[PDB]
Structures are given as structure tokens and as C-alpha cells.
Amino acid sequence: GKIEEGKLVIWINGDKGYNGLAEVGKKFEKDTGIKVTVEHPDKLEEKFPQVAATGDGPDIIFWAHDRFGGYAQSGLLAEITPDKAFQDKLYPFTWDAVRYNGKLIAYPIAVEALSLIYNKDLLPNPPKTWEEIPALDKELKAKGKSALMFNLQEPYFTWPLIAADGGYAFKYENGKYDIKDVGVDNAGAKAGLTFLVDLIKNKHMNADTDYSIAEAAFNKGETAMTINGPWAWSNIDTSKVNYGVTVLPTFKGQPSKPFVGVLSAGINAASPNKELAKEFLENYLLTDEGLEAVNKDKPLGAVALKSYEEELAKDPRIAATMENAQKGEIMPNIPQMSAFWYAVRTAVINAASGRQTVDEALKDAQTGSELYRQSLEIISRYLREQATGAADTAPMGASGATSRKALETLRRVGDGVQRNHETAFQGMLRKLDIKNEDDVKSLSRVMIHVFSDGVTNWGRIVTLISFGAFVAKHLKTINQESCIEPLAESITDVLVRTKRDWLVKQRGWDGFVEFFHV
Ligand SMILES: Cc1c(C(=O)O)n2c3ccc(Cl)c(c13)-c1c(nn(C)c1C)CSCc1cc(n(C)n1)CSc1cc(c3ccccc3c1)OCCC2
Numbered sequence: 001g002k003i004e005e006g007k008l009v010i011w012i013n014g015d016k017g018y019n020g021l022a023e024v025g026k027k028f029e030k031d032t033g034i035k036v037t038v039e040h041p042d043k044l045e046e047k048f049p050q051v052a053a054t055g056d057g058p059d060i061i062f063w064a065h066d067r068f069g070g071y072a073q074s075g076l077l078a079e080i081t082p083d084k085a086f087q088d089k090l091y092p093f094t095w096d097a098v099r100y101n102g103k104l105i106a107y108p109i110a111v112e113a114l115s116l117i118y119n120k121d122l123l124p125n126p127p128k129t130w131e132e133i134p135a136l137d138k139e140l141k142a143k144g145k146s147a148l149m150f151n152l153q154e155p156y157f158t159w160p161l162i163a164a165d166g167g168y169a170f171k172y173e174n175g176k177y178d179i180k181d182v183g184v185d186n187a188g189a190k191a192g193l194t195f196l197v198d199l200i201k202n203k204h205m206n207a208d209t210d211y212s213i214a215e216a217a218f219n220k221g222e223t224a225m226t227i228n229g230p231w232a233w234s235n236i237d238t239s240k241v242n243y244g245v246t247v248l249p250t251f252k253g254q255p256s257k258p259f260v261g262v263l264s265a266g267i268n269a270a271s272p273n274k275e276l277a278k279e280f281l282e283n284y285l286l287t288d289e290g291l292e293a294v295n296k297d298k299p300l301g302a303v304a305l306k307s308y309e310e311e312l313a314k315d316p317r318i319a320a321t322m323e324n325a326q327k328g329e330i331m332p333n334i335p336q337m338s339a340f341w342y343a344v345r346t347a348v349i350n351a352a353s354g355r356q357t358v359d360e361a362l363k364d365a366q367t368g369s370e371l372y373r374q375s376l377e378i379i380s381r382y383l384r385e386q387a388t389g390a391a392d393t394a395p396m397g398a399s400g401a402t403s404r405k406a407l408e409t410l411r412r413v414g415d416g417v418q419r420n421h422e423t424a425f426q427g428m429l430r431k432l433d434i435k436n437e438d439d440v441k442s443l444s445r446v447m448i449h450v451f452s453d454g455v456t457n458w459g460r461i462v463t464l465i466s467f468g469a470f471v472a473k474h475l476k477t478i479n480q481e482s483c484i485e486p487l488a489e490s491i492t493d494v495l496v497r498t499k500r501d502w503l504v505k506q507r508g509w510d511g512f513v514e515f516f517h518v
């Protein structure tokens with residue numbers, strides 16, 4: 001339950017240079033007498049938010065930057081406040097990757113992008129296009145080899161192809177994300193994923209291939225190509241395969257667009273060792289010697305530290321990494337990234353296995369990715385118009401008909417629940433004694449308990465939201481209207497976290513509208 005004072009516990013993924021990181025920890029111990037323990041738990045990016053929410057977990061968590069906005073939003077990360085001298089030692093765009101609501105919430109370490117890795121003794125020149133891979137596989141099959149194996153279990157590896165002809169996560173224009181505008185089930189995404197599925201149908205790839213299977217095949221000289229990041233180069237070096245690292249193939253004449261990650265280190269908000277952690281990260285790890293120790297274990301990519309990157313940049317494999325990165329897109333760090341990845345992971349796995357068609361898989365992924373924002377739209381608008389008596393005139397935006405009709409439905413059914421359950425609602429409002437924002441943020445734990453116990457149905461979702469409206473009316477009448485949007489956010493988080501899979505199975509809010517159709 002409590003993080004131990006006077007030591008450092010660090011989590012890093014098991015594909016990274018954790019032995020090199022431990023060597024940095026031993027240098028830290030030699031100076032300070034403070035022991036550093038490096039661990040690489042399975043699913044650490046899922047475990048961290050669970051354990052840290054209880055005040056437990058590591059002092060320092062390493063992951064790509066995309067998960068950190070979610071952690072920061074949940075209050076799990078300490079704000080990072082390096083001095084100018086330190087900040088100037090790292091590239092500005094790396095600090096940008098770890099900025100969330102105006103605050104730095106991790107230290108950037110290195111820039112990662114996937115590349116095409118190829119065996120020059122099988123394939124002296126890499127394919128420039130995805131479309132030529134089937135014919136190459138046919139040539140290679142006659143030699144008792146295959147063209148390509150890569151991890152089909154993690155959507156990170158398949159995204160570059162999905163993105164190539166126009167798939168996107170959240171639209172980015174005019175220096176801004178439009179979180180309502182999700183690009184998972186458009187014609188471009190379908191074209192990419194169909195190409196992948198056709199590779200599998202035509203026995204060029206196997207839907208069961210995972211990281212270890214692809215890595216072993218490439219490193220044993222059994223397959224001519226793989227798709228992987230810099231961390232994989234150590235094991236390829238050890239294997240003695242004559243390998244190149246190059247630009248990903250094009251699809252429909254367009255570059256493959258990898259999602260670019262910045263390996264980052266956050267400090268747990270519950271750590272009593274924040275000063276020790278800052279010292280470790282700034283004055284041991286983010287040094288030429290610290291990064292070299294990690295990079296010698298498993299390569300980092302293009303490091304954030306300018307002095308060391310100037311050495312590393314002369315490596316053609318790093319040049320290739322950066323070429324692919326420039327053709328791709330820096331991942332968002334918005335809290336909705338976790339859901340996007342979960343939705344797309346399932347879509348790829350189901351399309352690849354034949355459990356769903358591409359169209360079915362991508363429709364579900366779209367709905368899953370849109371769920372938080374659409375739910376918040378509906379719930380916020382209902383609570384606010386209930387509180388004030390006046391509706392919001394702003395356009396609903398994307399999937400607007402569904403939002404509008406869900407709101408219209410919820411007006412009917414939710415107004416009814418408020419009337420019929422006035423007595424329970426008034427009683428409970430009095431018991432909970434909500435006076436301010438602090439009281440609203442305290443509701444989540446109890447709300448999750450109540451709502452997640454028992455059966456799942458649309459009626460209970462209506463009760464959740466309708467009591468929210470009942471509370472919002474109270475908040476407005478005591479001059480606490482500023483608490484309504486935090487309330488709506490809390491209710492939305494409870495709903496979507498606890499009922500994600502059920503919601504997607506209903507066609508989200510279209511299910512709700514149909515369920516209560518008069
Ligand atoms: C039965 C019921 C449900 C449900 O079926 O899941 N929900 C209610 C919401 C409110 C009420 Cl009054 C009732 C319910 C209810 C009760 N009896 N009857 C006859 C009714 C209709 C009281 S026993 C259940 C209960 C409620 C709380 N506790 C400690 N136990 C307050 S902690 C909280 C909970 C919220 C909240 C939802 C929005 C905002 C704040 C919330 C703060 O939503 C919980 C999920 C929705």
C-alpha cells in the first residue's frame with residue numbers, strides 16, 4: 001500500500017535495456033547509498049494505473065509518452081520541473097511529447113519509430129511497396145523461406161499500414177486535435193487492414209504470429225523481413241544476420257505512417273522519493289554515460305539528449321528510424337489513447353483471425369474509440385440543461401445525429417426517472433452532502449462500487465445519469481455551477497470504464513436510442 005521511502009523502484013518494459021538501466025542504478029547507489037531496483041512486469045502499462053491509484057507502485061515508470069496523459073489526468077504523476085540548464089540539454093520536441101495541460105509530466109528519453117528490417121542474404125534490396133510482397137513471398141517459399149513476419153498481436157505494428165491510405169486516430173489540424181474526429185473506419189483504414197487480412201488469407205502471414213515468433217524467425221534466417229524498433233537490433237546483432245534497416249514499404253503509393261513514441265520516465269505522484277528520482281533521471285540517466293549504458297543493452301533510438309544524439313545520428317539505422325518517424329506522426333498523449341489502442345488491438349486480431357470481417361471490426365473499433373467523447377457530450381449537455389433550464393445551442397459535431405437523438409431520449413427517460421425516484425434521489429442527495437468540487441471528486445470510488453455491482457442494462461445507465469442531473473440541479477442552486485462539468489466527467493468515466501465491452505456490443509448510443517424508441 002505505501003511506497004517505501006529511501007530506495008528507488010523503477011518499471012520498464014521487458015523489450016528495453018533494463019540491465020543497462022540497472023547498471024545506471026548501481027552507479028547511483030555507489031554515490032548515494034540508495035538501492036535502485038529495476039523491474040519489467042508484464043502488462044506494466046495496465047498495472048501502473050491500477051497500483052498507483054492506491055498509492056502504491058514504482059517510484060519511476062518508463063513507457064512511451066502516449067500513456068502518460070491518462071496517468072497525469074488520473075493524478076498519478078508528479079509534475080517535472082527541470083531548470084533551464086537541464087531543459088536545454090534535450091530537444092524541444094521531446095519535451096513537447098511529455099507536456100500535458102501545460103505541465104511537464106515526464107522526462108523524455110528517446111524517439112522510437114518502427115522500420116523495415118531485412119536480411120540482405122535473402123533479399124539484397126528491400127521492397128519499396130507492400131503490393132510486391134506477395135510475389136516476393138512466392139519466390140522465397142520456393143527457397144524454403146518466407147518474405148515477412150512481424151507481431152500481429154499489437155496494433156502498434158499494423159498501424160503504419162492502416163494509416164497509409166488515410167486511417168487516423170484523432171484528426172490533427174491547425175495545431176490542434178479534434179478528439180471527436182476519429183479515422184478508424186474510413187476507406188483508407190479499410191484498404192490497409194484488408195491488405196493485411198489478404199496476406200493472411202493467401203498464407204503469406206499467420207494470424208497467430210506474435211513478437212517472439214517473428215523475432216525468432218528473423219534472427220534464425222527463416223524470414224527475409226520483419227517490422228520492429230531500435231530495441232530489437234541487439235538480438236539481431238547477436239544472431240549475425242546480415243541485416244539492413246530501411247524505410248517501410250509504401251501502400252497505394254503513400255508512405256507507411258508509424259505512430260512515433262517518445263520513451264519517457266514519469267515519477268509516481270505517491271512516491272516519497274521524488275527528489276531521489278529527479279536526481280537519478282537528470283544526473284545519472286540523462287547523461288552521455290547513462291544513455292550509453294542503456295543503449296548498449298538495447299538500442300534506444302534517437303535519444304533526447306543532444307550531446308549523445310550527435311554521436312548516434314551517424315548510424316544509418318538511426319537515420320532510417322528518423323526517416324520513418326518523419327513519415328509518421330507523434331502519438332497523442334490524450335487520455336483516450338488507451339481506449340483507442342484497445343479498440344484497434346481487438347479489431348486487428350478479430351479481422352486477422354476471421355472472427356469479424358474488416359468492415360465489422362473497424363466499425364466496432366470506431367465506436368470504441370468514440371465512446372468516451374460521445375458519452376461526455378451527451379451527459380454534460382443533459383446535466384447542464386437540467387441545471388439551468390436552457391439547452392446548449394452548439395453543434396454536436398461528429399456522430400451528431402446519434403448524440404442529438406441520445407439526448408432527446410435521455411430527456412424523456414431521465415426526466416421520468418427523476419420524477420419517479422424523487423424520493424430516493426432527494427434522500428441520497430442529503431446523505432452524500434455534496435458542497436464543492438472536492439466532494440464531487442470523492443464520489444468516483446463509491447459510484448464505481450454501486451454501478452459495477454449487479455446486472456447491466458440501459459435502465460441502470462439512465463439512473464446513473466439521471467441522479468447526475470439531480471445533483472447538477474442542486475449544484476447550480478447553491479452557486480456551484482462550476483462543479484457540473486467535473487461531475488459529468490466523473491460519471492462518464494465510471495460509465496465507459498465499467499461498461500466498455502457491453503456498450504460496444506449495443507452499437508453504443510445508437511443501441512440506447514433504439515432500446516427506448518417509442
Ligand atoms: C439504485 C441506484 C442506482 C443503480 O441502479 O446503479 N444508481 C443510483 C443512484 C442514485 C440513487 Cl439515490 C439510487 C441509485 C437509488 C437508491 N435507492 N433507489 C431506489 C435508487 C434509484 C440508493 S441505493 C444505491 C446507491 C446510490 C449511492 N449509494 C451509496 N448507493 C450514492 S454514491 C453515487 C452513486 C451514483 C451517482 C450517480 C451520479 C452522481 C453521483 C452519484 C453518487 O450512481 C450509482 C449508480 C446509479
Ligand SMILES: OC[C@H]1O[C@H](O[C@H]2[C@H](O)[C@@H](O)[C@@H](O)O[C@@H]2CO)[C@H](O)[C@@H](O)[C@@H]1O
Pocket residue numbers: 013015045064065066067112154155156157229261341
Ligand atoms: O500496440 C499498442 C501499443 O503501442 C505502443 O507500444 C509500443 C511501445 O511504444 C514500444 O516502445 C514497444 O514496446 O512496443 C509497444 C508495442 O507492443 C504504445 O506506446 C502503447 O501504449 C500501445 O498499447
